């Protein structure tokens, strides 16, 4: 009975580095067990920072939303994580 | 809970983030100016954070990091990088730094990181 959440991260406007920034979202899911099922732009274009101040996540997660949100907001140098369960 | 070691090679650099931390409510527990400094300094100092400028590779900070994690697995780590470094950066994070923030030091920025890191 694991979950799935959809998550959008948003980072402010001259936010640096922002894969970097974007790969401590994608390492703190993998922390927690989290396996991401899609994502919006693809993980290439991620990682070659062709996006401009948000991400999209669908993930599988064995964790509850309030761990999961709690997790995702330790995360220093995020405007806003929207969360909401699938 | 508050004591932070800076290594940067610069002392400007390190002035600037002493400026930042004290006013931020942290404590300078001490400074390094290479990785060998660091993990001298992380042993006698055992600070609660670590501030890590990983701006010139040539000077080793990301060797540093590791050695520091061997020291202490649960070690908290701020890398210092630079624009056009996120490779460097993802680099750190999986060898085991917790954050970064990016040059020129901009104040909200740090204080979040050290915020968070704890």
Not at chain 1, 47 to 61: A, D, G, Q, R, T
Request: hydrophobic letters at 45%.
């Amino acid at each position: 009975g694991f979950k799935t959440f959809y998550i959008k991260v948003i980072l402010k406007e001259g936010t640096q580095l922002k894969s970097a920034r974007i790969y401590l979202v994608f390492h703190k899911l993998e922390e927690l067990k989290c396996e991401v099922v899609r994502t919006i732009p693809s993980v290439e274009e991620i990682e070659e920072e062709k996006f401009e101040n948000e991400v999209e996540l669908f993930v599988i997660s064995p964790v509850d939303l309030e761990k999961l949100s709690e997790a995702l907001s330790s995360i220093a140098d995020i405007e806003r994580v929207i969360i909401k369960e699938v | 809970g508050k004591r932070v070691l800076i290594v940067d090679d610069a002392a400007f650099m390190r002035m600037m983030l002493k400026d930042i931390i004290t006013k931020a409510g942290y404590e300078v527990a001490g400074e390094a100016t290479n990785g060998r400094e660091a993990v001298e300094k992380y042993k006698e100092l055992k600070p609660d954070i670590v501030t890590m400028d990983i701006t010139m590779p040539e000077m080793n900070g990301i060797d540093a990091i590791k050695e520091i994690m061997k020291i202490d697995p649960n070690a908290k780590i701020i890398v210092c990088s630079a624009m056009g470094q996120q490779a460097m950066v993802i680099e750190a994070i999986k060898a085991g730094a917790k954050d970064f923030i990016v040059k020129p030091f901009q104040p909200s920025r740090v204080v979040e990181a050290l915020n968070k890191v704890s």
